[PDB]
Symmetry: D3
Subunit: 237 residues, 6 copies
Amino acid sequence: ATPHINAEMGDFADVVLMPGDPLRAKYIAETFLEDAREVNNVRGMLGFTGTYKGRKISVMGHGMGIPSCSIYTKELITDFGVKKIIRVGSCGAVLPHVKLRDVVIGMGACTDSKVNRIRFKDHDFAAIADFDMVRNAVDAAKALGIDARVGNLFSADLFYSPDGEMFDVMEKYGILGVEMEAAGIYGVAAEFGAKALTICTVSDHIRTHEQTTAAERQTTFNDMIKIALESVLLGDK
Amino acid sequence: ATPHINAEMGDFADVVLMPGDPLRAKYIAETFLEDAREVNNVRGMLGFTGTYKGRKISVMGHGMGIPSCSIYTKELITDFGVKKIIRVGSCGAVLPHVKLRDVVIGMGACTDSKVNRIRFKDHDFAAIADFDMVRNAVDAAKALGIDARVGNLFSADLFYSPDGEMFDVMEKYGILGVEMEAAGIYGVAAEFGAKALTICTVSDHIRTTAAERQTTFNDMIKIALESVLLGDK
Amino acid sequence: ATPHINAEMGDFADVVLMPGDPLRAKYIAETFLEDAREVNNVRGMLGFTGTYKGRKISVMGHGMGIPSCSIYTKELITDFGVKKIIRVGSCGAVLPHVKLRDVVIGMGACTDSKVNRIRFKDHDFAAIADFDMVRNAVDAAKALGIDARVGNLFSADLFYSPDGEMFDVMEKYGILGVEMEAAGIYGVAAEFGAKALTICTVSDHITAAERQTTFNDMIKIALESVLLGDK
Amino acid sequence: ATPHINAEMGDFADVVLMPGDPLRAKYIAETFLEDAREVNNVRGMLGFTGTYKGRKISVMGHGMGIPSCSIYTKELITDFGVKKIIRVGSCGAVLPHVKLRDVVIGMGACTDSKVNRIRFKDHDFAAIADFDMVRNAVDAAKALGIDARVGNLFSADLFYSPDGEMFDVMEKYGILGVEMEAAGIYGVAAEFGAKALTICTVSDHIRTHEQTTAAERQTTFNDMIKIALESVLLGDK
Amino acid sequence: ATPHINAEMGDFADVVLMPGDPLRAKYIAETFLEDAREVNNVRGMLGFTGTYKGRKISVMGHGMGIPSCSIYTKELITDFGVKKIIRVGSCGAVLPHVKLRDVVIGMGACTDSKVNRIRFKDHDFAAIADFDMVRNAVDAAKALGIDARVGNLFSADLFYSPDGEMFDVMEKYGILGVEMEAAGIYGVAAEFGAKALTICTVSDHITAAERQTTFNDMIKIALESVLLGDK
Amino acid sequence: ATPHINAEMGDFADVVLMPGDPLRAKYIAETFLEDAREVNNVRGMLGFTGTYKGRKISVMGHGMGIPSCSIYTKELITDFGVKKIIRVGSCGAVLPHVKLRDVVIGMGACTDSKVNRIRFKDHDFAAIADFDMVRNAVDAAKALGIDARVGNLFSADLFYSPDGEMFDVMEKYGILGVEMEAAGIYGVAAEFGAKALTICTVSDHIRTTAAERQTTFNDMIKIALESVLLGDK
Ligand SMILES: Nc1ncnc2c1ccn2[C@@H]1O[C@H](CO)[C@@H](O)[C@H]1O
Ligand SMILES: Nc1ncnc2c1ccn2[C@@H]1O[C@H](CO)[C@@H](O)[C@H]1O
Ligand SMILES: Nc1ncnc2c1ccn2[C@@H]1O[C@H](CO)[C@@H](O)[C@H]1O
Ligand SMILES: Nc1ncnc2c1ccn2[C@@H]1O[C@H](CO)[C@@H](O)[C@H]1O
Ligand SMILES: Nc1ncnc2c1ccn2[C@@H]1O[C@H](CO)[C@@H](O)[C@H]1O
Ligand SMILES: Nc1ncnc2c1ccn2[C@@H]1O[C@H](CO)[C@@H](O)[C@H]1O
């Protein structure tokens, strides 16, 4: 049992999918895993462990923001023997050709957080995913006949940014989606020696329209889940 | 109304207490509020509204971290007409004279996030609470016969800090407690013109029983609710 | 004796009022203190000690800028046993409804100085006053029939800022008045463990009505807050 | 003709390999390309264009440092129609299990340069390579039976760093090699809309021994070149 | 008249010597100038104007800290037609062979102030003196049989630095002396287009031998450098 | 001896002129030096050593950029006993009174690289030239009857700046010329205890014939070589 996770070594698989929303986690456990067993609930952060095609998998929420998922990802890696982390979240689009429900794979993640600067002597640490994991996810996609753009995400500390001019900068450098934890998860993965990948579904467009919470914890967003789960199986081989 | 709260203008009071744990919010509503009804739960972030001694009040969790509590408090201010935000959580102590179970009141909050530099042209913004609100809590604490420290809190971005060095720094400049959102909430308050205050009970020390721990948590909440009554006058 | 204060332990009271102008420390000693006696003159920075309603108090200027007030404040706290520092000065207002002559208590002080980042490992240190001192000042003003504003101040390093766009930012976050030392004094107070407070009278929006009035009111507010503090 | 390149549209291929050393470039043109024709020499920065198995390719040096290769890569992209840039350089190893002549592929590149901060409003821009290009290079390697680690590189402004404690930080976050321009090339690629990849051969070990300039412009360092050239052909398909 | 200088165009010479100590501006007017006349007293910051070997010159203190000297310097340049500013002060030495009483001309000034970054879009602005003024000062000292050291200075914002490890860094890069304003003055000079120079006498390694000597020597060096400048 | 210079202690003079272009170094050696022999070329970075009016002197290119000239100048100081480094290049002008072909002397150099903050604990280090060296060049320029401006240079990391805004800033604070290495070389000089100076001729302006351009380049070099003679005394 860690400060935020009441579980023991073994309750979790070596691989756990992590959405920011705990209710999406329950939905994942219920819709895709077999013999799903709840292993955590300390602050409502639901944790589940079951099997997808024989493969033992776990799925748990990490909350919103980099300092939130940093806590969870860290405890999972250091105290529950977890090896790979695949964040299954949502994000806002800034590029004109990016559509809602489009799946994005972040091989990299920019950020306006100071976390990585704190652990890299105020320099620029490129927050990147695990190449193979990224590739497992690309292959999985092609095999499921689902589209997916591979690129940089931007992990923001402020959902409601006081600086909108930064979206022109993001767009210029073509960041695929705006979310809030990828860059923190990668930094943690690296700091504690683990492997991770962030997959996201465009839930809204910074320049246009959006979805609903309901749609966000159950509708589609099944594509990224299928992709995530299948890519894991690819990694097993 | 918003993607993180499925309530509508009128569902929340103009004063909202905010613990980090969604489960603690249900606990507060259940323990101190009468005729309380759940007003939200889109991400498990339970929110409630009821009345404390005839006063309409709300209680909702903000999750761990500045980025998280920034989304909720911001939405509460601009979308649900909330005027005051009172965070009620816990913190770790760094100074020796500060003991377990102490009720700390953050008049100001230092932080290691770039959130406020981003909104303050990279300069130093002093994230402070609302004066009267701090005072209402101090007075309310005296009435409940419970002494309370007032000072600086440190809002950390990393609960598991790689830079263990900051603790000696924090102690050097005498920050009372260490938590993870005071500076974030104060920043929102300043930006959208609202009032906020965060009270904490010392849960640990860098250097007691549950019945005693739980008694102090309830005191913090009583001080919170009672301060709101004082300000009403 | 210290590099900038030619005096010995005991010469200063545990409480010191500090105007920016050295010429005003003398005025205060003559106008409000009793049995005053000069205790410093090192650089024309006149310091005095006397009593107010029996309470021992000292007065001495700190000069303009954080670096300046920082030298004096530190030396007083670490070498003259001083425990409280009340800065009494002026400031410019940026907000639409903060008027000339108003009184503002700086509960906190924003700054463009790199002084606290150097102290706080380049992190955000909330330079704040001592709450009790804030409340005392607030209570002192109410008794004097004055309505003080309690909020944030902006301690600027450049009186003549290269960019005036920052004044909008300041309004946006409701800073009450623009001055040049509050954040420096608070920084020193936190570093050497002592209590500090800054009270300012709006002298412009970025005579008798000033002196025998507002300025005098602010000094009365300060001195009376000390007594309340002693309670 | 650009300020630093005396050539015209067409003299260069859409793909050009770029080592920091102009003499290594001549060596590449001479050893691997056919009908090699010199297209530049303004400040000794030799430029060559020929063919590798029918494919028209160019190879030119970019000098040492981020501000140097920034000039060249920029002019190439904006004035000579270049689309893909593959840096073929050398680097120092900081990890104990990294050996001289080991080939490294940088999917990411950390840096202590301020360049990306200047173009990203003082935030953290993840300097990453083009995924497909990275994968072309991985596949090429497996096909040539050559080993290659994929990861983060660190682009340094100071070869002789006044801060050696930063190597512990680099090593901790497992950066594969220390070089001096990857992060600048990626930033330019993104700022001007082009695709790029950085391949490096460990020329020395920060904690141990090193090679010679001669070995650096001709010996081995053929592996990365073969990998680079072949991966391009893969990308053509 | 300006916020901190109660005078009108014409009251100051196009050249102004500036000690940190206001009390020393008066000493210089009496000891070296001729037909001096007070031109300011706003905050005890005494300013004087007279002539040296027929050359019109003014003397006035700037106070401690960059913020301080920055207010005066700017007002002099933009409102009183001043074209040259020579700072004459003291500093502490960190280098092993820079001795007490030595004279150092700051060709450049390092700083921990955020003042120029605010001016230079957070980039590195080389706060430098006017070369001619440096050379004039250097030539002036040689004639006076004095061997001045020309190099870098470090303008510190905190007299009492929270970390003393920086003093090693300073030695490593050979800074000649530690003071508190040179980089601020240079910044203002560059911003409003004017020439500035800082001359310091080593007063410590971080009496008659000081006054009627070193301090007097430095003032002689300064005044004579002006005349050479006029050539 | 080193991975960027294949010479040995004795191959270089204690004073080295450094243009950015390796080809320009060969041009200087060929045009002003007698009995000059090539002392290096590992990356095409030609280096030469000969004598100017009986004085032993070297000329070697440093490539474009601070990171590049930092490697060479550093190696020259610590590995080949070099005492003085005199960069001789070109720059762009930003101020109107500064005309094409002006010979600028950088007494100081502003920069936008983190190189010096890295070595100066993130504080402001004033990258300046050696005083006497600046003076020797000023005197030598008068003798050659050529006026010369002395002031600040700006060492840019990005020749193609995305932030076009800096030019007005540079002009505001009156920096004479814009190049790419002065601050880098000065930083090395300070760090390894050596002396350096960079002279530039204005090649362009942000707002003439080759024979005239080439005449001014030679003047710069003559001023460089002649300044070295003055200092020798
Ligand atoms: N437009 C946006 N800006 C910022 N974050 C966004 C979006 C859209 C989705 N998310 C992600 O969902 C949570 C906050 O809504 C966060 O956990 C975040 O990853
Ligand atoms: N010692 C500590 N360091 C950091 N955060 C701490 C503590 C102690 C309590 N908290 C609070 O609890 C939540 C994260 O555990 C956070 O919401 C935070 O307020
Ligand atoms: N409008 C303003 N901007 C900046 N400082 C101001 C004002 C008004 C008053 N002060 C105070 O006076 C000194 C500098 O003039 C400073 O010490 C400061 O306390
Ligand atoms: N140990 C090291 N530290 C820094 N750069 C290194 C090495 C080793 C090789 N390189 C690369 O080669 C050039 C400088 O030697 C540069 O262009 C650089 O990419
Ligand atoms: N050792 C030191 N450290 C810092 N400042 C010093 C010295 C020595 C002299 N000064 C000068 O005196 C004023 C501050 O004491 C400042 O204005 C400064 O010019
Ligand atoms: N306008 C400019 N901006 C930047 N660098 C410039 C110029 C003009 C000349 N230089 C110098 O030439 C080289 C890069 O072209 C560099 O080595 C540099 O010294």
